[PDB]
Amino acid sequence: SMEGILDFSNDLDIALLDQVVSTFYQGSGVQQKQAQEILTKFQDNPDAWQKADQILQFSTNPQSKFIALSILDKLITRKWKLLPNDHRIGIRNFVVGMIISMCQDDEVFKTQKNLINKSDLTLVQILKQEWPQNWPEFIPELIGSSSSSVNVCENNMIVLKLLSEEVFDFSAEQMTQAKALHLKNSMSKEFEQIFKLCFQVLEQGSSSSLIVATLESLLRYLHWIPYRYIYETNILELLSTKFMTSPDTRAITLKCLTEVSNLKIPQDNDLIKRQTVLFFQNTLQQIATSVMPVTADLKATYANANGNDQSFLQDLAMFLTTYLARNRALLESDESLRELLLNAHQYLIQLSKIEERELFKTTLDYWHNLVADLFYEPLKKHIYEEICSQLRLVIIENMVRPETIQLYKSEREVLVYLTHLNVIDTEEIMISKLARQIDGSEWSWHNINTLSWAIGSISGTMSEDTEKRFVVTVIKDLLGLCEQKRGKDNKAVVASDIMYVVGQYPRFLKAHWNFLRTVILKLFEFMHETHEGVQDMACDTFIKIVQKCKYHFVIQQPRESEPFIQTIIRDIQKTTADLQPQQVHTFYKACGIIISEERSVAERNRLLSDLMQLPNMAWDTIVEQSTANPTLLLDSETVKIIANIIKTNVAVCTSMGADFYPQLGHIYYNMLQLYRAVSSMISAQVAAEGLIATKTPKVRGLRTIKKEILKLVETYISKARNLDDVVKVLVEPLLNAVLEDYMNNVPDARDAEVLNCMTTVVEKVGHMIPQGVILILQSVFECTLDMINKDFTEYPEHRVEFYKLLKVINEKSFAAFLELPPAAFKLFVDAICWAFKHNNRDVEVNGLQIALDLVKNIERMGNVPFANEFHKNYFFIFVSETFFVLTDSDHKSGFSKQALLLMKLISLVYDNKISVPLYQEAEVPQGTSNQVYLSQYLANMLSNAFPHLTSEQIASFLSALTKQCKDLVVFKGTLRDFLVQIKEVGGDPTDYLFA
Amino acid sequence: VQFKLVLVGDGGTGKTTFVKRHLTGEFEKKYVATLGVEVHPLVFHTNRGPIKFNVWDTAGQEKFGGLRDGYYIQAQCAIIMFDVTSRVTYKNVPNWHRDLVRVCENIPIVLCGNKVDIKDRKVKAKSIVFHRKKNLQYYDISAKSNYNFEKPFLWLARKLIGDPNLEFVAMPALAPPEVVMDPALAAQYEHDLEVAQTTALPDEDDDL
Amino acid sequence: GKIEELAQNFETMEFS
Amino acid sequence: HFEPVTMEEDEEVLYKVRAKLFRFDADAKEWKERGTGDCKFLKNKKTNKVRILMRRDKTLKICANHIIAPEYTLKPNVGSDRSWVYACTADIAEGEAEAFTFAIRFGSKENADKFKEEFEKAQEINKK
Ligand SMILES: Nc1nc2c(ncn2[C@@H]2O[C@H](COP(=O)(O)OP(=O)(O)NP(=O)(O)O)[C@@H](O)[C@H]2O)c(=O)[nH]1
Ligand SMILES: [Cl-]
Ligand SMILES: [Mg+2]
Ligand SMILES: [Zn+2]
């Protein structure tokens, strides 16, 4: 029954409309949902705008009038210039009239702010179409009407605010460059008269609602108006004094002054400098006397969250940091300004204590600006001694966990600067802090962790002697703290912090072997501790110390009979006995870091052999009993043992890279045989159980083996220095092991990792195995494309790796695509375009890059048959497919690379890089240039794709576009202008002459 | 005690998936574009009693926009959503905020950067500063890993109730009833159980 | 000197 | 003299384990998550009856609340060695009693096997 309003053959029943609207906004459930579908259908009727004057006059429902204005908005922003001129004048007169009568009725003005604001916005859409060329008296009459009514005057401030926003803040995306400049110049041309009204209202009082609306509009003006309006009038005085006293105006005024601080100002005028000092001075004065003194506990105030206090303190932080980042030098030389300077910074100190992450980041950014300057700028740091001292405590006490990551690094940077500015004070604060952890007056898990991170973060700032004394005191004190606490929970926390600090001071460890050795032996002890987190902590600290101190493990230390790396390897079974597989791998990886420091090849290989002794023995055992009874591989235990062996090899190879080669050679051939055996079992399982088999633990275990084997090979080849060996020993066995298996498995059984592995092979040695690359394409190209060309969702990993593989092949071995049969090369082109249409960023970017690289590859071939045929077959396919994604509004993330590709394609023609004609000898006269034919093809293409464009628009667009095809920034601008114009009717073709 | 919440942001940013997580606990992998709006009641239990959000989950795609800013009327709070793996979705945050605060001039708003579970993050944390001058609360969230997924509603609850100390609490757990299933459905449930067993659980590589 | 004492001290750290 | 200025606490926790709970949508042939959090076996002191009570992290909302009936049976899922599937005839997590086909997955096969052990111990409690 509600669907009656959708019947336009009859009159519109306003009572029925209001019911549908009420049911949507105030109703619920199924009825609400139904009304929603009706209203949307109503609103999207292209004739609904005609029934808008009816609603705005005879409705008693504000939501209905709002919806009516939304219908008008669509019409004004998209189809305005198509209307008969009388409808345009009618719609305009109706909107103006409706706004006036709403403002005159105090009841409506008070209770319908939403409907009035919508009407104002609608008026502004008309202005963007009609003003000033067809409405030159708008501003003069606005200023006139303002004097006759406070309500109209206030509403005019809202209208101007929205106008300024639409013209200066939000025009870049929504209108053409020419249209935007036209409106900006028009506003700028009449702003003198606008400001006069604005300033008079501010100076003469008194309605705060009117004052606030005027200040709201001022905030928008400050984005673009010349500085003279602010500095050559008395308005700064009003902002920084009068309006900071009233809380109603205080919030908006503060935002205005923040923007004033960003105005474009001459830096050589002493009077202006005085004006900039003065408004700051006035503002801080008002805060101290009307809001809170500098001693106030802002942390507590913010936490209480009364009224608008949180927003105010946020806005005060923004004001103070913005002004001081730009102007604090104005306050630094004059002794009479010192108190002001330090009071402003003391407010920031207090603001910095607030528990609010995002606000802390804002203040922290400022502190960084400050202490960096004090670190470099002569004669400045003594000024801020007491500020910096307080800041040290604030940062130390709010240190976050290292490794969010971003905030810790920012804290570290500021605290390192503060430590350089005064090492003695930093040390004292930290030792003091540490004592209050020992006497328990500030003891907690959070407080000891925070202090430890802080102590760790300033590593490298002290002298080595001071650092030595410092590290000793801290570890001594922390060790005492650890013994003091009972229960594994407390001891775990302190022990972790102790290990964290030593790990942060490698310089200390490197200079004191006996101590480093003690630290490492202690970690080995902790690798037997079953308490949650300890083993992880022990392993992470181990590899972290090794990364920084590896040299001291590989050389023979004084008073030692051997390099400590030998000692670690001898006892490795015992050390790692209680660790989980992941943690063992980390341990072996850490050992690989050390072994790679040994540059005697014979010794390095011996160490490598000894390190891999346990996995190699386990390996040899399995390879023997694996090839004896392949049923073993169905034993989940054997599968897990095998995966972990391979993972151990990946871990060590990750550390050793090129050096890992002898170990790879130990297992390589049997490993690929294992790969084949596992592959058969997966196939057999899928045959006997169906696709569901791929979900079972057994098959997932088997596929893990294959994936880790591929990862190992990938990891080595990506780091290999001897590519002769890669090509002549590794590649052929690899390809024969993996390619046919991939091709001849059903889609759900194919490992995307194969593609990833092949991408690395082509990347490093592709140029040396052209036959190999062809073999790769044959085995994976068509069958993978068929997996991913039915939608954008299935096989997401195969999708991504596929285009990465094509990308590197197109870069390193383009010859391989030349060998493709014509039908297969056609699929290659189809695949690239298919990549364009993805929203998936991974796929889209590679799709566009391949297209670009492909065109360049074809170009480099010169005037030859394959290049000529390529352009005949695929040039306009690439042009039109690129245009499609450029203009369909669903691929905006790719705009830049689409533009680049398009520009490249067009430039080929206007440089005569395409020798043969792109047209049929029938469809165009003999001797016609490709340049002429290109313009024809494109004009026809755009005309059919965008039939609401005039021939003139299309012709002007293409004229501009092609002539700008050597200027990417300008070219891109013309495309953006085009994307605007296709959204509406009657766009100005002269817009394309902007550049 | 119910509050209207409007949820806005670019298409595909995870608005619907986010609300679904809160409504049923599920994670919806498929992208089915919201058409216009979907309204969903959402109740949280607090130490100040239950709080009800009427969540207006709006469409981010323009072709499915529906009533657009008409959905914002009389909203008492909002979440603006973007995708940290998609820069364009962050670039459009000022556009959503604009359309929103023009209708809702003074309401608590949370800005959410969704999908922080994804390794290849494109919108870096240090780039995200829009909320500062606009007094929006900001959270990194992930509907997939549930990272901070409760924070937006907790912050909003605190603003709307006026209690900075408001906390989510455990709803009362009544004693469940005893079982007496008739044998006349013994073959029926055994059918539905066989299908359930032979359909693999999703995300078997996850920690849980 | 006092570092050898620190090492000795570090060795005595244990959970139980 | 100066003047100065849940609903499960009548129960005992027999077992506790972290887990992820799924419900089967038979109309979509699709498993759907219902919640992640601590799964507890709660023994009522006044009836000695044992139930599963599970809550979501952070929101603490109940995603499972039902008696560990003696008639229920834990079955393995084809794709997992750390999960159990079983039919529940009356769960009251979301309002009225409703029947579900649940699956519950754990951190390890060990926690899963232990769960099954505890689950069956609790079943014979609800027999007595
Ligand atoms: N990795 C990851 N994916 C997510 C996350 N949140 C949502 N997604 C996925 O993003 C896609 C879009 O989700 P959706 O909720 O429909 O987005 P939307 O904002 O509601 N789109 P629309 O405005 O068109 O209705 C889905 O595939 C969803 O599974 C997340 O936190 N992490
Ligand atoms: Cl903080
Ligand atoms: Mg949606
Ligand atoms: Zn004004």
Author numbering:
A (entry chain C): 0 to 376, 414 to 439, 461 to 1052
B (entry chain A): 9 to 216
C (entry chain D): 5 to 20
D (entry chain B): 64 to 68, 78 to 200
What's written in the study?
The exportin CRM1 (Chromosome Region Maintenance 1 protein; also known as exportin 1 or XPO1) is the most prominent nuclear export receptor in the cell. CRM1 recognizes its protein cargos through 8–15 residue long nuclear export signals (NESs) in the proteins. The NES-binding groove of CRM1, which is wide at one end and narrow at the other end, consists of 5 hydrophobic pockets P0–P4 and is virtually identical in all CRM1-NES structures. The resulting CRM1* construct, with ScCRM1 residues 1–1058, Δ377–413, V441D and groove residues 537DLTVK541 mutated to GLCEQ (to mimic human CRM1), binds NES peptides in the presence of RanGTP and RanBP1.
